[PDB]
Amino acid sequence: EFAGGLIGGQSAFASQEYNFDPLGLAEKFPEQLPFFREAELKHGRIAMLAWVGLVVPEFVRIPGPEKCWQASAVDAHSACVXXXXXXXXXXXXXXXXXXXXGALTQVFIFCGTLEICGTWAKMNPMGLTMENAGDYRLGVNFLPDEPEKVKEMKLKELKNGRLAMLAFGGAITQATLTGSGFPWLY
């Protein structure tokens, strides 16, 4: 069985299986395949949200700390974190800014808390397997009750995630190279 029987390896021309793995990592690391699918789904979801929030600020910009909330999508990370002391280390000597402190570290700490009580709580305490890889039981009531419908919905999630990962890479690289608007072209 290819890659422990995970959704995502089936071709689209049907009657065929893309089972894309030129490096053969699925057979080299079968004990970390659930972690591989966890990472793939996490990257896909983060990249979907990242592409959406790479397009949107070109139109609307939340009015806030003017130090951030300004500039191109490229100059929006190092600007919305400011000259932190070393890296993601709050300046306790001068909280309330007045020189150097973060503006996203709140997003960072929220992501850390959610991740620890999310993936870490799923793996360390009293358990992830092949089937429950990306399944955090979030919005499963919306999932249809049919064996193939769930499988095709998961496949659509996976393929949208891969497309969003590649798309975000291309979009951010083009924006860095050129600037410009949504087309991200010279």
Partner 1 sequence: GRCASSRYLQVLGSIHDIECGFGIDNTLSLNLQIFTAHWGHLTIILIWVSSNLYHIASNANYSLWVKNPIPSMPIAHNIWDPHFTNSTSTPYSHTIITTILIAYSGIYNQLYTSGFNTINQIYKTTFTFSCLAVISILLAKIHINTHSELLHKLASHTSQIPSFFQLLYFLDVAISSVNIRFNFHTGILVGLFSIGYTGHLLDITIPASRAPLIHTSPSYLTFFGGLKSNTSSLYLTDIAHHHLAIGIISILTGHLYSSFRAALGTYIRDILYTSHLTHSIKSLHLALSLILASCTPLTSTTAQHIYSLTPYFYLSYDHIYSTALYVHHSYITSFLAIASHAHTAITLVRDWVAPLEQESSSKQIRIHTHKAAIISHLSWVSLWLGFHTLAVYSHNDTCIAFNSPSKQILIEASNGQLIQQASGKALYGTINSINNYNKSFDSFIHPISPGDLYVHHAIALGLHITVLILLKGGLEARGSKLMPDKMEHSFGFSCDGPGRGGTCDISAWDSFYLATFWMLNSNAWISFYFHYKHLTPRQFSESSTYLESWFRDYLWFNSTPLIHGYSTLGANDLSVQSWSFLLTHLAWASGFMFLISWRGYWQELIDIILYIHLKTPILINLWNGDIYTPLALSIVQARFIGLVHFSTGLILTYPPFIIGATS
Partner 2 sequence: XXXXXXXXXXXXXXXXXXXXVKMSPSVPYLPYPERLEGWVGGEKGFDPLRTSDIIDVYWLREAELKHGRICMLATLGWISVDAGWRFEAEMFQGVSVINAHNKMVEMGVMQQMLSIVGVCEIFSLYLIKEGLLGKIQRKAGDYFIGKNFLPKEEDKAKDMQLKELENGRLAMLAFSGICTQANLFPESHFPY
Between 30 and 53, whose beta carbon lies closer to ligand UIX? Answer: 53
**In angstroms, rounded to a whole number, what is the distance separating the alpha carbons of residues 173 and 167?**
10
- CB neighbours (10 Å) of residue 80? 19
Cα–Cα distance, 4 to 27 (Å, whole number): 9
Residue ranges in 147-176 that form contacts with ligand DD6 under rule CB under 6 A: 166, 168-169, 172, 176
Binding mask 48-87 for ligand DD6 (x = CB under 6 A): --------------------------x--xx---------
Residue 162 to residue 20: CA distance in whole angstroms: 13
Of the pair 45, 159, the CB lying nearest ligand CLA is at: 45
Ramachandran area for residue 137 (φ above 0: left; ψ -120 to 50: alpha; else beta)? left
Residue 156 binds ligand CLA, judged by CB under 6 A: no
Nearer to partner 1, 96 or 99 (CB): 99
Q: 48 is in the binding site of which of partner 2, partner 1, ligand UIX, none (Cβ under 5 to 8 A by kind)?
A: ligand UIX
